[PDB]
Design a protein around this ligand. Structure first.
Ligand code: HEM
Ligand SMILES: CC1(C)[C@@H]2CC[C@@]1(C)C(=O)C2
Length: 405
């Protein structure tokens, strides 16, 4: 279902990409998006799918567009439009200077200082989960680790019951990788229904959990409102539940198929931080966008006020103009160029958290299970959307080649 081309769009700029169902998804999600950076594709295209919107395809344009809040507003950041209209998360549906204060708060809950505090539980949980898996010689990495690992840690942070997981997860998934089962609005309302009660409770009877801090926070000198907190927590939730989860699977899928990469990490462990970057570059997985606030000519293309543009965070690091041999994984690249965690004012707050989770996983996994692969005759399926994912990851290994710690 293609939407009739608006009059301001030149035909030569049309490239019908479907962010929710890219053509050669079989080849992998990143490769599927990379079609956009082939020679036959202009830097800025219009797709008729998902209601019609612009896509910027080069590191350079995405970076610029992200800097330019004046022109490119976070107000309606999701495609399609109905979803972007419904989106009211804080601080992401806010432009500076309004953004600034909410950002400072969210930072209190997720910043460096919190990561630093939780470091021992992160390490504790990863070790616990790996050790538990080790002797089985087989898991479902997505369900067995990638999910519980980050999730349980967020739940700890949030002070929410692990009992809620399955439910929260269904709803978050509905937002990034729509099923068809529920609209964005519908999904958002249900998450909101979950949070309302809890927020009220923590406004009265505060604790030390992230939710308690957000609920009782100060913004622009005054007390945050109930609605505002509901809206920030909505963000925290999506962030805790939906990002690190998918990334881990992509990384692990890769590590499963590259003996030589695993080995490099085992002998020269001082390279783990470098490799984490490179993996973040190569298995980049978020794509959102901005809304034109007014008519604006950008790189010779005339954008009209109200036009939505997708600026794929995933795409920067994959652009050959940014990194030579972009689909190649090189842990010793002199310069790892990406915008996996965004660019401009909205730069991911949770990045420190994400980095710790990844790095721990890599060291702790390789220590114990150095040798593993994908279960024979497994068809590994990726999924596209706001946050791309791996459907399942069947891994197999010889218990005898493992190391108990
Ligand atoms: C691999 C993991 C992650 C990736 C790829 C990622 C990606 C993103 C991106 C692309 C944005 C900016 C979106 C925009 O400019 O429209 C962002 C913002 C944000 N992220 Fe993440 N994120 C990650 C992990 C997390 C985690 C675990 C948390 C929660 C602890 C989180 C919390 C946030 C928040 C609060 C913001 C909004 C900052 C603001 O609007 O100023 N992130 N993230
Ligand atoms: C694009 C994002 C990664 C950022 C945090 C969660 C997310 C899905 C949004 O709605 C804003």
């Amino acid at each position: 279902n293609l939407a009739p081309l608006p009059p301001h769009v030149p035909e030569h700029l049309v490239f019908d990409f479907d962010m929710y169902n890219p053509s050669n998804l079989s080849a992998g999600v990143q490769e599927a998006w990379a079609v956009l950076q082939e020679s036959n594709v202009p830097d800025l295209v219009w797709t008729r799918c998902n209601g019609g919107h612009w896509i910027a395809t080069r590191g350079q344009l995405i970076r610029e567009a992200y800097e330019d809040y004046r022109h490119f507003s976070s107000e309606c950041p999701f495609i399609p439009r109905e979803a972007g209209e419904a989106y009211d998360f804080i601080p992401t549906s806010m432009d500076p200077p309004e953004q600034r204060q909410f950002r400072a708060l969210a930072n209190q809950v997720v910043g460096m200082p919190v990561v630093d505090k939780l470091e021992n539980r992160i390490q504790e949980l990863a070790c616990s989960l790996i050790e538990s898996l080790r002797p089985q010689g087989q898991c479902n990495f997505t369900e067995d680790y990638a999910e519980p690992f980050p999730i349980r840690i967020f739940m700890l942070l949030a002070g929410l019951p692990e009992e809620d997981i399955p439910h929260l997860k269904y709803l978050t998934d509905q937002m990034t990788r729509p099923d068809g089962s529920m609209t964005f609005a519908e999904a958002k309302e249900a998450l909101y229904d979950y949070l309302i009660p809890i927020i009220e409770q923590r406004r009265q009877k505060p604790g030390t959990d992230a939710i308690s801090i957000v609920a009782n926070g100060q913004v622009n000198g005054r007390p945050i409102t109930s609605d505002e907190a509901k809206r920030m927590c909505g963000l925290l939730l999506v962030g805790g539940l939906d990002t690190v989860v998918n990334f881990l699977s992509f990384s692990m899928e890769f590590l499963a198929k590259s003996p030589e990469h695993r080995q490099e990490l085992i002998e020269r462990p001082e390279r783990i931080p470098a490799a984490c970057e490179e993996l973040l570059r190569r298995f980049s997985l978020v794509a959102d966008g901005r809304i034109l606030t007014s008519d604006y000519e950008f790189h010779g293309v005339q954008l009209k006020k109200g036009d939505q543009i997708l600026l794929p965070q995933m795409l920067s690091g994959l652009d050959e103009r940014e990194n030579a041999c972009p689909m190649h994984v090189d842990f010793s690249r002199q310069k790892v160029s990406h915008t996996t965690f965004g660019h401009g004012s909205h730069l991911c707050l949770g990045q420190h958290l994400a980095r710790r989770e990844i790095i721990v996983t890599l060291k702790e996994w390789l220590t114990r299970i150095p040798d593993f692969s994908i279960a024979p005759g497994a068809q590994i399926q990726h999924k596209s959307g706001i946050v791309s994912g791996v459907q399942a990851l069947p891994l197999v290994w010889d218990p005898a080649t493992t190391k108990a710690v």
